[PDB]
């Protein structure tokens with residue numbers, strides 16, 4: 189069994205994935221838990237994500253392949269399949285739908301401008317990670333959920349604990365307990381003090397309409413907050429890094445910003461974001477895949493970043509092509525667990541790029557590229573700091 193995940197080298201795709209796609213699904217050994225099959229070929233990853241025989245509900249209570257000593261538990265979206273998953277996801281679908289996040293575009297741009305203001309007042313160099321990439325999406329998801337602004341820093345502390353693959357399990361357990369107690373309290377707060385936020389609407393669904401249990405309500409609230417805190421914070425930094433090291437792309441995006449959506453989709457395809465955050469499904473029946481047979485009860489993991497460079501699906505897959513047309517990337521997943529945050533994340537990435545490139549037409553690295561440091565032993569690829577001048 190191949191040790192997994194591979195040690196990250198920046199945002200580079202590990203060269204071993206090229207050979208992996210051309211063979212049968214490989215046996216992998218994670219740091220803890222069951223061994224598993226690893227699927228990398230685009231068609232094979234799509235099959236795992238669409239075939240109901242590969243189940244996240246079946247993973248609960250198993251010795252899951254994972255990065256941490258203790259296995260995940262829960263009642264929410266990452267733990268269920270239809271029809272239970274559907275009842276939960278329908279309650280969040282309105283707020284995360286493209287139609288309902290689009291009105292946030294102006295607020296997101298105002299926030300970006302405010303953050304860029306503070307970078308200007310503070311003087312060069314700025315750090316795009318601490319000064320922009322972290323605050324912008326964390327603020328937004330807090331506003332959508334109805335999380336009070338004063339708790340930003342406390343919640344980012346928790347996010348840093350979750351983001352480290354190396355967090356000692358006692359600390360992870362005590363901060364975990366306190367985070368859940370905090371969210372229990374917020375759910376009480378939104379029932380006494382309703383608002384036009386998602387957690388208020390989810391509290392109604394639980395405690396007035398009996399549509400979800402208290403366990404399901406708390407699971408969804410915690411899942412949505414954590415995912416919102418750890419995903420786009422790192423991805424914004426990664427996209428600015430790739431744009432800065434491909435400067436020949438910046439003048440088109442600055443002058444003709446209607447080109448930014450397609451570039452965001454290409455960068456979504458290209459960038460390996462999630463590493464330690466990888467869901468393991470368990471097969472509920474025997475399944476033939478890639479010339480091998482995945483037995484009932486065995487575990488399967490996917491590598492979306494590898495599938496996203498499969499030469500049968502993408503022309504010139506190893507090149508960053510910012511106007512790429514045929515781009516059916518799996519950067520947000522597929523099937524019933526397709527990223528519920530995709531429209532919000534997309535909007536944030538688009539706005540970040542539009543605002544920063546307009547406000548800072550001379551933006552460039554403030555250190556040599558060799559002096560950049562990537563986060564180590566993280567669950568998500570990202571930079572520790574991104575020093576820029578302008």
Ligand code: HEM
Pocket residue numbers: 237265266277329411412415416419420423461466467492518519520521522524525526527528529530532533
């Ligand atoms: C660029 C940022 C993001 C990327 C690359 C990303 C990626 C993904 C991927 C690949 C999956 C599918 C995983 C699988 O099926 O194994 C997924 C699911 C999910 N993501 Fe996103 N995500 C991002 C941002 C977000 C945001 C902002 C939120 C919440 C506000 C979010 C919440 C979720 C949830 C709750 C699911 C599970 C949905 C379900 O099971 O029904 N993600 N994400």
Ligand SMILES: CC[C@H]1[C@@H]2C=C[C@@H]3[C@H]4C/C=C\C(=O)NCCC[C@@H]5NC(=O)/C(=C(O)/C=C/[C@@H]4C[C@@H]3[C@H]2C[C@H]1C)C5=O
Pocket residue numbers: 254255256258259260261266350364414415418419462465466467
């Ligand atoms: C952006 C999309 C991401 C998404 C973002 C955040 C979530 C991840 C972080 C949540 C909790 C956390 O780490 N610690 C608290 C208890 C530790 C316990 N021990 C584990 O092993 C374990 C997990 O593995 C959890 C994985 C969660 C899957 C979620 C991720 C799925 C991806 C597609 C536990 O919950």
